[PDB]
C-alpha cells in the first residue's frame, strides 16, 4: 500500500520500501510544540510502531489512511 | 509549516 510522509517530504502518499506492511501515524511535538499539541509524522511501518511514552504512533492500511486529522478550517 | 493535528497546510498548521 501507500502512506503519507510528514517527517520527510511535505505530505504525499508514496509507496515505502520492503518491510512496511502498512502505514502509521507517529506523534510527539514539533520543534515548537505549538498549542496544536503534537505533530503527525505518518508514513509506512511494518506494524504499529507505537511506543509507550510520547512516541504515540498509530497505523493505517487503507488507501491513504494516513491523512491525520488536520485538513480542516479551524 | 507543519502537519500538526490541527491543520495540514503550512499556513494553518504553522
Amino acid at each position: 500500500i501507500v502512506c503519507h510522509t510528514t517527517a520527510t517530504s511535505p505530505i504525499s502518499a508514496v509507496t515505502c520500501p520492503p518491510g512496511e506492511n502498512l502505514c502509521y501515524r507517529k506523534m510527539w511535538c514539533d520543534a515548537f510544540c505549538s498549542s496544536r499539541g503534537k505533530v503527525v509524522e505518518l508514513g509506512c511501518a511494518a506494524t504499529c510502531p507505537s511506543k509507550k511514552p510520547y512516541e504515540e504512533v498509530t497505523c493505517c492500511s487503507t488507501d491513504k489512511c494516513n491523512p491525520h486529522p488536520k485538513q480542516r478550517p479551524g | 509549516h507543519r502537519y500538526y493535528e490541527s491543520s495540514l497546510e503550512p499556513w494553518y498548521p504553522d
Side-chain angles (χ1 to χ4, degrees):
Chain A
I1 61 163
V2 197
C3 329
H4 319 297
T5 90
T6 5
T8 32
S9 336
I11 251 179
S12 75
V14 329
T15 314
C16 242
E20 300 90 338
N21 314 159
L22 69 117
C23 328
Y24 78 89
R25 325 158 123 207
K26 243 173 257 226
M27 252 154 194
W28 31 64
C29 247
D30 191 25
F32 292 60
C33 164
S34 299
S35 306
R36 316 275 32 125
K38 331 316 220 95
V39 205
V40 205
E41 318 223 351
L42 329 101
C44 318
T47 50
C48 345
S50 236
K51 273 273 71 56
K52 305 97 181 282
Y54 37 103
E55 272 190 79
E56 235 221 85
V57 200
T58 326
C59 277
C60 134
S61 79
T62 0
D63 266 289
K64 300 172 173 244
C65 39
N66 242 206
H68 52 124
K70 349 62 38 195
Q71 278 170 73
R72 176 199 166 188
Chain B
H1 158 229
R2 257 250 157 299
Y3 351 83
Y4 259 87
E5 80 125 81
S6 167
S7 169
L8 201 281
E9 315 301 280
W11 218 279
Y12 281 10
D14 158 38

